[PDB]
Design an enzyme around this catalytic site. Structure first.
Site, short mmCIF file in Angstrom:
data_model
loop_
_atom_site.label_atom_id
_atom_site.label_comp_id
_atom_site.label_asym_id
_atom_site.label_seq_id
_atom_site.Cartn_x
_atom_site.Cartn_y
_atom_site.Cartn_z
N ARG A 55 44.99 44.66 40.32
CA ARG A 55 43.72 45.00 40.86
C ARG A 55 43.78 46.24 41.59
O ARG A 55 42.51 46.71 41.66
CB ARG A 55 43.40 43.99 41.89
CG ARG A 55 43.75 44.43 43.38
CD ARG A 55 44.39 43.23 44.17
NE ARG A 55 43.70 42.37 44.72
CZ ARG A 55 43.75 41.95 45.98
NH1 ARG A 55 44.31 42.91 46.91
NH2 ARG A 55 42.81 41.21 46.67
N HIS A 72 46.71 27.98 45.34
CA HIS A 72 47.71 28.54 44.72
C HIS A 72 49.22 28.35 45.40
O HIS A 72 50.03 28.99 44.74
CB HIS A 72 47.43 30.22 45.06
CG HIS A 72 46.34 30.59 44.23
ND1 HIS A 72 45.11 30.47 44.57
CD2 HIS A 72 46.61 31.59 43.25
CE1 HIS A 72 44.31 31.25 43.89
NE2 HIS A 72 44.96 31.94 42.73
N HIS A 118 42.52 29.77 50.11
CA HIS A 118 43.42 30.21 49.07
C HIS A 118 44.43 29.67 48.71
O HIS A 118 44.96 29.36 47.56
CB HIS A 118 43.64 31.88 49.38
CG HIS A 118 44.08 32.47 48.13
ND1 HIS A 118 45.44 32.56 48.14
CD2 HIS A 118 43.58 33.15 47.34
CE1 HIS A 118 45.78 33.48 46.86
NE2 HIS A 118 44.85 33.56 46.52
N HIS A 167 39.32 37.32 46.16
CA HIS A 167 40.17 36.94 45.19
C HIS A 167 39.44 36.99 43.79
O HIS A 167 38.35 37.07 43.84
CB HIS A 167 40.47 35.47 45.64
CG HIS A 167 40.59 34.26 44.26
ND1 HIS A 167 41.78 33.76 43.86
CD2 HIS A 167 39.58 33.58 43.64
CE1 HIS A 167 41.53 32.87 42.94
NE2 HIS A 167 40.20 32.86 42.77
N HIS A 168 40.11 37.30 42.81
CA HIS A 168 39.50 37.33 41.45
C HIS A 168 39.49 36.00 40.71
O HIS A 168 40.42 35.13 40.73
CB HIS A 168 40.36 38.17 40.45
CG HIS A 168 40.13 39.66 40.99
ND1 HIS A 168 40.95 40.22 41.84
CD2 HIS A 168 39.39 40.77 40.40
CE1 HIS A 168 40.34 41.49 41.90
NE2 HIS A 168 39.70 41.66 41.10
BR LIG Z 1 41.12 41.72 50.03
MG LIG Z 2 43.45 35.04 44.39
#
Ligand SMILES: [Br-]
Ligand SMILES: [Mg+2]
Ligand SMILES: [Br-]
Ligand SMILES: [Br-]
Ligand SMILES: [Br-]
Ligand SMILES: [Br-]
Ligand SMILES: [Br-]
Lengths: 131, 87
Positions: free
Chosen positions: A4, A130, A126, A101-102
């Site tokens: 990113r 994950h 998050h 987050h993407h």
């Molecule tokens: Br961020």
């Molecule tokens: Mg993420």
């Protein structure tokens, strides 16, 4: 670097949000990017991810509607480009700030600065996804 | 640095909290430095609301550095914990 952390331009559309935007950050898929913020940023270019993050939180802190949802302590951080601190209940160890987050991994085709690909999440939420 | 809240006077602790709360860049030029000061605050006060004292304060009191200090002072007094150094 991370995938990113790349040059790009903001594009895409956010979503209309409520009077408690970041209430969504701790559940489901995260909080969407507010349409006003996607608008404010549309077409801006970023050299790297920290540049984007800084402009994103400054935009939040200047927005007449969203800035009402943050106390003066938080705005003092956000005006300077910093993400707000989350509630103690949403801290997950060393991570104490809202994260972006993407939804679709950049390695899977996702847009780095496409506003339809971004969510704001708490650390606790998050990690639920994950770990 | 001071290790325990009983090394601060109340005025000294207020000035540290005002620095964190207003994001005084002379004291915390970087985001990383501010985060450290917030973690230091949580440690010093021993208060169970931690950073929420600063950012998500109870509606029963003033949202300000003085509000924060008073909440901390009164809570530690009520638990029998050491207080601020006398000024
Ligand atoms: Br961020
Ligand atoms: Mg993420
Ligand atoms: Br939160
Ligand atoms: Br892209
Ligand atoms: Br004093
Ligand atoms: Br004050
Ligand atoms: Br005291």
């Amino acid at each position: 670097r991370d995938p990113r952390d790349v040059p790009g331009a903001a594009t895409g559309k956010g979503q209309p949000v409520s009077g408690n935007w970041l209430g969504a950050a701790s559940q489901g898929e995260g909080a969407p990017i507010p349409s006003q913020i996607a608008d404010k940023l549309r077409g801006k270019t970023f050299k790297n991810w920290r540049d984007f993050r800084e402009q994103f939180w400054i935009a939040v802190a200047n927005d007449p509607e969203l800035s009402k949802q943050f106390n003066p302590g938080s705005l003092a951080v956000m005006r300077d480009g910093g993400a707000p601190y989350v509630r103690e209940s949403e801290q997950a160890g060393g991570r104490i700030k809202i994260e972006i987050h993407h939804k679709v991994r950049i390695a899977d085709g996702g847009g780095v600065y496409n506003m339809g690909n971004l969510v704001a999440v708490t650390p606790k939420r998050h990690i639920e996804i994950h770990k | 640095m001071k290790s325990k809240i009983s090394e601060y006077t109340e005025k000294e602790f207020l000035e540290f909290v005002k620095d964190i709360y207003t994001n005084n860049k002379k004291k915390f030029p970087t985001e990383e430095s501010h985060i450290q000061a917030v973690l230091e605050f949580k440690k010093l006060t021993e208060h169970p609301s931690g950073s929420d004292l600063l950012y998500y304060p109870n509606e029963n009191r003033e949202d300000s550095p003085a509000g924060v200090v008073k909440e901390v002072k009164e809570w530690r007094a009520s638990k029998g914990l050491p207080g601020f150094k006398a000024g």
